[PDB]
Amino acid sequence: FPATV
Amino acid sequence: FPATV
Amino acid sequence: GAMGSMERASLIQKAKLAEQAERYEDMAAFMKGAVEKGEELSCEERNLLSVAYKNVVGGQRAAWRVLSSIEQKSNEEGSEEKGPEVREYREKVETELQGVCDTVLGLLDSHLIKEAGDAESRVFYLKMKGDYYRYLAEVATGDDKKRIIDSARSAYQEAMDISKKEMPPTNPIRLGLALNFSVFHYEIANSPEEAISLAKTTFDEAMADLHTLSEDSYKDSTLIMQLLRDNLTLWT
């Protein structure tokens, strides 16, 4: 999965 | 801590 | 509210203890109680709220993905019929996840967003609104799916519009918003080119503003810039 914050 | 199972 | 009898300051203190103990469901319940006291939240308090619910919903999303993959395998040609149980349990986790999202969105609508006037509070809450609609969109399949996606988009876009007018390009809230809206474009809206363009422009505009920052601010901003680059590497 791509990075999120 | 010591090991337990 | 089960937290109605607890002092606001005690709820905040216990949220911090729960964080140290990695008790994120408790942390979220304490922060929900603090929000329901009706006062605006400070920067630290807003981040306690977000850390708590992000950990809770993150665990639910990870579990939903495992169960969804099992369900997909159980439905392909040649698979042995295993009964309704996989779907039922995926549905159980999904309903609990939706409940968490609805709770967060409820706190934002009653009444965090309407009282948030400074960019750092209002952008943060609108980012959260976009994030929790995005988590709803990840599991959505019904008549309202397009409306769920558009609700996420609309919240992200309002946050973006404010952030561009009222924050420097290195502001970590602005950066994290852009990171997440870019992921929305890639994973939810089927807009990989928009996702890539947003990540690239955000990174480059932040790079050009780093010279204005102290060492500590530089660390905060470059951390999120690296996540933008990580996604660009994944996508190109």
Next chain:
Amino acid sequence: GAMGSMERASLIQKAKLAEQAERYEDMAAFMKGAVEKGEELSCEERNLLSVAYKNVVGGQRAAWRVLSSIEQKSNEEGSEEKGPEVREYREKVETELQGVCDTVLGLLDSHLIKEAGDAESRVFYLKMKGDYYRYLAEVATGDDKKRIIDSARSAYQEAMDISKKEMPPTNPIRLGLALNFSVFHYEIANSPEEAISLAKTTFDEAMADLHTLSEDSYKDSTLIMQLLRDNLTLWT
């Protein structure tokens, strides 16, 4: 019982799905429902029950230890009085932990142990009884503390007596029982010499029986033997 309307086989299937999804509270609730169907549990089912509750109570114990340490620091000379909140929240986690232990002990007493006649079932359940009384003892401070410790000891001792008569010294249930009873001696009963003696004798008697085993059994037994050695290294 909220699981009363679900088929036994469906509860077992969902416990396995919950394990894959790392949803151990759900796993434990499903296995509790399966036990409450009233039938004896197979070997695999007994281990699903134990894996589920061990993960749940393990998280509670870790959280309790964090909170207890904070509370201890807040009570030493020179510390700023932080109010009742640390104690209150430690007490909340402690009460939830005690509730889990009481639930497991309740399943064992109604009626798993009384129907367990084979050594592999009965030793396993008596080991679990000793383990959950040990977790109660870790947090106990009242008039009943010595009785809680003695309940753990008594369950472990009955399990040991059966295991020595009815299982080979390499049996993994027997080994894990001895490992845990040794930790009971060291950490609960203030008997480090008994703990060390038990770990050493268990290890040496298992070593001498490894020659009888297949490759797969050898792997199972040596894994637990290494834990015995790890504890001996920690303690000597």
